[PDB]
């Protein structure tokens, strides 16, 4: 408990806020919110605000359903770009049924349920550190995004330099001012691609920070006449954007993944987690990569993962074990992209790891022989398997796997499947200019 | 009694107002007003101002009739956008005959008469909460509205964001400053469509707040180079604008619609009100949807009601029962649009509910089987009936129903019928560009 009701009232009085954005996240990952004046703040703190819960279902909503808006006090953040006519503050809210029960269709509530299951098994917390990457594009005269990148930088290069501009520096400075724990910030391989690293927090706090980071980055980029995009693969032939997740599991003693007497200084819990993560990777690939464009990133030659394998040092492994040990022991999943919903991805990953721990599965031997060297047939003999190549195949794999369904819940699973099938059907029947360029003149 | 004459004089002296707009509402719903200097304010408070009452009849006025302008002290509001050369204040006024009798053709007086009948039957107040939705369009170079929306938002989406603009945020702030009880404000399904919710007040106060809200929203949108429209269906293939009414009936004990021992925690009074509302819905559909464009909104597939049925959770029911209970028990009618006259709509709805209570009618069973699934014939076997598909059919239904005529009064009924028949004839004989696009070349 970081803040209380009285603290929130005092903050609202002293910082002179007149608007509060009670925000939440739908199934598709879009940040939505209800806006209330400061005069209603007391009612908001009484968990008495009603709204339409069907919006959580996204565009596949059918029937209006009334739901409560239980806010979280610890998520109180005051925005700085609010001029002087009253400031704006936000609090991430939980969704509750009218019968005082958390909504099963809320991704945050689902993540809380999965964390409760993990605590039941014996662990304390699930620390996560994300590595989101984003692209910056120049705006047009009509304030519309173009295809021109802001700079032709390189990997870890000092490309933006000093003397103005350097949108990454301004973004990180305002994030630090807003109260974000930023570890580092650097230029990525692709031109105009930047990465900012976070500190390791709890699962829920990390997901909330991810959403707030996306919002703040987009707003600040728009301030400087730029468009910040988190599309997995905005351009062809260039490196994509990833959101590598470094996860660690903790218990009463300390880090559960660390064991000085184990092989690679890894505990049996870490190996069981690896086995669970690798066994069901084909299952949750759809959740971790929920867009059509996402699977355009999962292609060989751009450091994105393409095969289900783990290693300590390899060219684009699905799961990577960083060399750091002790309390910093962690497992990195590299298949996640910034377009994914953080809550759903964390829920499915935690469910897979928990299932692996419960079943005590033995992970396959790590591969370090450049699996890209052989053909598909030459590596299918071993345990190396391909990730789904399209969103439809990933959806089929979701519909087959049961543990991921249990980790998502029936409501979320059904609505996610419906929306993604609609998306796939919409993309399949479209006629793209590629087809015209390839066949209009030839045929 | 919130204000007295001395209070009004003190306010006029201290805020330095030089103009007072004595305003009222005609049959068609247009806000009209007579403008007087502050020096006449005393006379205005003596109920001695004469004006032409025929303006209430709208364009179908024939003979000039002198009428008094009894103002309401509790409606004193000082506008903020008045510069320094004297401020402007308004008071909603009642219309009285020269023989010191309220005018029967005034919608506000008619609503007061219906409320008197309700109090005679035994109830105390009729609380109403409206949910108006409006569209925002960009203005042209000549300050003329265009067909381009201000933003491509979504349902409950954080589309306008921070960093300037956000007309909705500016509007609700000025409404709060002016002394409005705003519950919440969010983005609607259609792009450029916004919804601001009110607190539940009395019928007359709610209608006055609706009119003032329309005026203030239009003025503020014009301030920021935008056009705010309350047309039920400005664009084809996009969600329309509605003004759902959440009504509750109160008595000496408390909420008359709440009963912990009843089915669905609803009292017999609530069921009688439902039966009355559903029985005469075909009758007052004309009053609740008085424009030609209104029936363009009442089409399937856009969440607008199309069949006479009630449910607690269904895709677009005519009457919806929110899950909230206790003092918040209420019935929601969703067929009302922002173009309707609030006073006439409340009068006819109250008359229908009162008739249902007096006759003790049994409401039909709620439908939850997606009535849209069957055809018209397959659902006409049950109690499900279609709403009128055009304004002419609704006018015929008005001319048939007698209870709605009694609730409207002879003067208002005759003038409304005349104006609406003129409107229907004007629309019927017009030649639209649709017809030319469909037949000019073919035939």
């Amino acid at each position: 408990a970081k803040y209380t009701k009285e603290d929130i009232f005092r903050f609202a009085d002293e910082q002179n806020v007149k608007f509060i954005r009670l925000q939440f996240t739908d199934i598709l990952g879009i940040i939505k919110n209800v806006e209330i004046p400061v005069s209603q703040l007391k009612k908001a703190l009484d968990n008495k605000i009603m709204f339409d819960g069907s919006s959580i279902e996204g565009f596949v909503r059918i029937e209006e359903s009334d739901m409560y808006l239980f806010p979280d006090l610890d998520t109180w953040v005051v925005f700085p770009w609010t001029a002087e006519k009253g400031k704006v503050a936000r609090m991430i809210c939980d969704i509750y049924n009218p019968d005082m029960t958390p909504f099963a269709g809320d991704p945050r509530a689902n993540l809380k349920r999965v964390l409760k299951e993990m605590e039941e098994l014996g662990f304390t917390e699930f620390n996560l550190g994300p590595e989101p990457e984003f692209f910056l594009f120049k705006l047009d005269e009509n304030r519309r995004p173009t295809l021109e990148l802001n700079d032709s930088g390189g990997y870890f290069d000092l490309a933006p330099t000093d003397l103005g501009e350097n949108c990454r520096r301004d973004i990180v400075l305002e994030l630090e001012e807003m109260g974000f724990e930023i570890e580092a910030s650097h230029h990525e391989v692709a031109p105009g691609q930047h990465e900012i690293d976070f500190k390791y927090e709890d699962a829920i706090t990390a997901c909330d920070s991810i959403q707030t980071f996306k919002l703040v980055v987009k707003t600040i980029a728009r301030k400087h006449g730029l468009h910040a995009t988190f599309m997995p693969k905005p351009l062809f032939g260039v490196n994509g954007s990833g959101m590598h997740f470094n996860m660690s599991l903790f218990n009463e003693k300390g880090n559960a993944f660390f064991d000085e007497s184990g092989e690679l200084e890894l505990s049996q819990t870490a190996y069981h987690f690896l086995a669970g993560m690798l066994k069901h990777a084909r299952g949750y690939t759809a959740v971790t990569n929920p867009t059509i464009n996402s699977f355009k990133r999962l292609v060989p030659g751009y450091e994105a993962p393409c095969y289900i394998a783990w290693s300590g040092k390899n060219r684009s492994p699905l799961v990577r074990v960083p060399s750091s040990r002790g309390l910093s022991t962690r497992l990195e999943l590299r298949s996640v992209d910034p377009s994914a919903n953080p809550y759903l991805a964390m829920a499915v990953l935690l469910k897979a790891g928990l299932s692996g721990i419960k079943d005590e599965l033995t992970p396959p031997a790590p591969v370090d022989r450049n699996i890209y060297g052989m053909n598909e047939e030459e590596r299918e003999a071993t345990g190396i398997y391909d990730l789904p190549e399209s969103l439809g195949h990933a959806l089929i794999e979701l519909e087959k796997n049961e543990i991921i369904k249990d980790g998502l819940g029936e409501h979320i699973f059904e609505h996610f499947i419906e929306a993604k099938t609609i998306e796939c059907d919409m993309f399949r029947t479209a006629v793209h200019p590629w087809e015209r360029e390839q066949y209009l003149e030839i045929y | 009694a919130k204000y007295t004459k001395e209070d009004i004089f003190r306010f006029a002296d201290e805020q330095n107002v030089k103009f007072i707009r004595l305003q009222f509402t005609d049959i068609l719903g247009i806000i009209k007003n007579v403008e007087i200097p502050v020096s006449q304010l005393k006379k205005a408070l003596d109920n001695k101002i004469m004006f032409d009452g025929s303006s209430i009849e709208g364009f179908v006025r024939i003979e000039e009739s002198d009428m008094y302008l009894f103002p309401d002290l509790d409606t004193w509001v000082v506008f903020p956008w008045t510069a320094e050369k004297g401020k402007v204040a308004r008071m909603i006024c009642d219309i009285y005959n020269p023989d010191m009798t309220p005018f029967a053709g005034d919608p506000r007086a008619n609503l007061k008469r219906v409320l008197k009948e309700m109090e005679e039957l035994g109830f105390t107040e009729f609380n109403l909460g409206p949910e108006p939705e409006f569209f925002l369009f960009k203005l042209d170079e000549n300050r003329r509205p265009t067909l381009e929306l201000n933003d491509s938002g979504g349902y409950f989406d954080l589309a306008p964001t921070d960093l300037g603009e956000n007309c909705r945020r500016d509007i609700v702030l000025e409404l709060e400053e002016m002394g409005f009880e705003i519950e919440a404000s969010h983005h609607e399904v259609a792009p450029g469509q916004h919804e601001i919710d009110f607190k539940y007040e009395d019928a007359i106060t709610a209608c006055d707040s609706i009119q003032t809200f329309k005026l203030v929203v239009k003025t503020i949108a014009r301030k920021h180079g935008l056009h705010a429209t309350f047309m039920p269906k400005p664009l084809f293939g996009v969600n329309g604008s509605g003004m759902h009414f959440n009504m509750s009936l109160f008595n000496e004990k408390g909420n008359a619609f709440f009963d912990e021992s009843g089915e669905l925690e609803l009292s017999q009074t609530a069921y009688h009100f439902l039966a009355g509302m559903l029985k005469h819905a075909r009758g007052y559909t004309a009053v609740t949807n008085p424009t030609i464009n209104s029936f363009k909104r009442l089409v399937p597939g856009y969440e607008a009601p199309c069949y006479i049925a009630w449910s607690g959770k269904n895709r677009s029911p005519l009457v919806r029962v929110p899950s909230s209970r206790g003092l918040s028990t209420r019935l929601e009618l969703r067929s009302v649009d922002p173009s309707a006259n609030p006073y006439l709509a409340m009068a006819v709805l109250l008359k229908a509910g009162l008739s249902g209570i007096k006759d003790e009618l049994t409401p039909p069973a709620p439908v939850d089987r997606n009535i849209y699934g069957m055809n018209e014939e397959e659902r006409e076997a049950t109690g499900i009936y279609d709403l009128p598909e055009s304004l002419g059919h609704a006018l015929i239904e008005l001319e048939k129903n007698e209870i709605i005529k009694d609730g409207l009064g002879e003067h208002i009924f005759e003038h409304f019928i005349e104006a609406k028949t003129i409107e229907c004839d004007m629309f019927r004989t017009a030649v639209h560009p649709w017809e030319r696009e469909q037949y000019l070349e073919i035939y």
Binding site: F59, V60, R61, I62, I422, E423, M426 | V189, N239
Partner: peptide, 5 residues
Amino acid sequence: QLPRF
């Protein structure tokens, strides 16, 4: 249900 299609 289907405002995207």
